[PDB]
Design a binder for this molecule. Sequence first.
Ligand code: HEM
Ligand code: HEM
Ligand code: HEM
Ligand code: HEM
Ligand SMILES: *Cc1ccc(-c2ccn[nH]2)o1
Ligand SMILES: *Cc1ccc(-c2ccn[nH]2)o1
Lengths: 146, 146, 141, 141
Amino acid sequence: VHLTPEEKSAVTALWGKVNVDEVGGEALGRLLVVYPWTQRFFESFGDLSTPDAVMGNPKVKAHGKKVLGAFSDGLAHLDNLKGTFATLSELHCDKLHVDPENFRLLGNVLVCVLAHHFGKEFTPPVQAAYQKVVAGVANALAHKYH
Amino acid sequence: VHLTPEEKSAVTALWGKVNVDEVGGEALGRLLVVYPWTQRFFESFGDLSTPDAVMGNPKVKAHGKKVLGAFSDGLAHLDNLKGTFATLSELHCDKLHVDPENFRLLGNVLVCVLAHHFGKEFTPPVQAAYQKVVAGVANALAHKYH
Amino acid sequence: VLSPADKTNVKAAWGKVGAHAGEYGAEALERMFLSFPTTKTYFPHFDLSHGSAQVKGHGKKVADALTNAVAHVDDMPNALSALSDLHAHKLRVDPVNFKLLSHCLLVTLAAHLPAEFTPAVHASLDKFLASVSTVLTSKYR
Amino acid sequence: VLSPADKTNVKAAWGKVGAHAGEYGAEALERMFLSFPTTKTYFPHFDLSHGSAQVKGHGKKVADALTNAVAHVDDMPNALSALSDLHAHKLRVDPVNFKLLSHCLLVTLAAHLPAEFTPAVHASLDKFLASVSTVLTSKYR
Ligand code: HEM
Ligand code: HEM
Ligand code: HEM
Ligand code: HEM
Ligand SMILES: *Cc1ccc(-c2ccn[nH]2)o1
Ligand SMILES: *Cc1ccc(-c2ccn[nH]2)o1
């Protein structure tokens, strides 16, 4: 993925403020609430039966934190997303059989959560840079399908 | 690059009986009729205003012949679909900006056309082998998006 | 959204299914399970072997539900409410799977009713099955 | 299919836009044009520079149409028929672009209305925009 140096600084500056305890769990939680069929991949996470239950679920928060850390690792290796995510792509494609459209949905849910947390700081140019990142992450996740 | 040997034998055997002059125009025509936004990519082709006008359009039939030629090229190189379609991927993705969901739709329209022509000979196992072909073709055409 | 011509096309073509309901439904299920094996995991306790009586009986249920949907094409949320309870609330079926079954239904119809499966009718059947799929995958209570 | 709760979620959240209709609609279009440059090809006659007056005025038309859709949430095919004629019959917009704009509208709402944009309301807004999108990409006349 090609960010301009101006885009890279804006992305990096925003990401450095991200609440790593909550943002990932809110993104995974919203995925589970807005696209309920994704709950089928998380049968062992306990109570997913209501929106409040999903968002407050400690297993959702803990797993979302891992998601966010995967995005953080992608941000730090934009030149080699395919190799950064090869292990995760094997997991999500060969083992879990996640439909790659869901990779895209989760990336866009993350964008909504960033907009939600940062308000007007999440400008259209900042979003545009983040859309290049999440498209790049989602494609790397899907590589073992290609 | 992964049809089984039995799937390759099935697709090869059926494709030997396919009318290379008709099936492509029928598939492209039905794409334009069933998914009418695809007509936007063919502004210069003339009358596309009704099902009968689409299926009777000489430019649609002639283009459909080129489509099917490229599918034939893919079927002759089932383990290298990416290389077979590399140049078409640049055209469709970089130049024409066709959303790759449309590649999957055309693939399944072709499967419907095969089903329509062969009837009970288009058995479930024959279909399943062809689903891997058209999925591979669509993935190959989308490669420049990957 | 279906046009009047869409509704006319769907009723005429699906009316030609008739007594072949269970047969075409079971064939479409078998085509889906074989073409898209991940769909089998929605049925973990089924006998999905070729020609299984269970899949025969299930294809009959699918086909009959579609006949019901055709009869209520202007009232599908009300008419299919129990099926939405099952597929959207309990099973939480990924809508991509409804695209797979819808395609396999069109493949089955094209293979058995070639004279009926015109481009215009194909187009209308696709929209109809997309509409049914939206109802079954949406939680609207 | 929208539940009774979906409808009241949408009316409450969209009702907060108020006098920000043009600002928010224009912002959603700007986000779309900047994040997904291929969408610009539907507006070749437009001035699409940032802060363009043409984009601002167009953003207001979009917002107001959504307001009208919210008011007619139980009969959208009827209320939105003119917009379907434009987007499906004349412009032939690929449905993927409706997903892009819908996403950018959600982003705009999240950025401006954080108290409104709860997980359940986010879910209802997504279903609402998807249903609007289906009407505008369907040829049902
Ligand atoms: C698109 C970006 C995504 C990223 C960056 C991501 C990241 C991750 C990470 C880091 C793990 C932990 C793997 C490990 O510890 O070995 C994981 C596991 C998992 N992912 Fe994702 N994921 C993504 C999309 C998805 C989606 C869309 C789904 C399903 C709808 C999904 C389903 C799962 C499941 C079921 C697990 C295993 C949870 C468990 O341990 O039970 N992933 N993912
Ligand atoms: C998925 C399998 C597809 C195959 C194998 C295929 C194959 C081809 C071939 C062989 C050509 C001729 C290229 C040349 O000689 O320059 C072509 C051109 C073209 N294709 Fe496709 N195509 C596919 C899908 C699509 C789809 C889904 C669309 C649009 C929805 C599309 C839009 C076009 C257009 C606009 C042209 C240029 C036609 C012209 O104006 O001359 N293609 N394609
Ligand atoms: C045209 C679309 C569909 C129709 C009309 C349809 C209709 C039906 C009907 C009538 C039943 C039986 C309900 C009952 O026994 O009370 C059923 C059950 C079921 N359907 Fe579907 N269905 C559709 C799509 C799908 C898809 C795409 C999937 C998954 C890939 C699916 C998964 C299931 C499952 C798991 C059951 C329950 C089986 C059991 O445990 O007894 N359905 N459906
Ligand atoms: C998703 C919800 C959408 C809504 C509510 C909407 C609403 C509108 C409205 C109200 C107009 C002006 C109609 C008039 O002349 O009074 C319009 C025009 C237009 N729309 Fe949309 N639209 C949507 C999606 C899209 C998308 C996704 C695209 C393309 C990416 C698009 C492309 C256009 C174009 C090209 C025009 C004509 C502009 C002009 O030349 O005046 N629309 N739309
Ligand atoms: C009512 C309905 C079902 C599917 C559609 C459609 C046509 C084009 N895009 N979506 O409309
Ligand atoms: C009525 C409707 C249109 C789209 C949806 C939906 C529910 C979950 N995902 N999409 O429902």
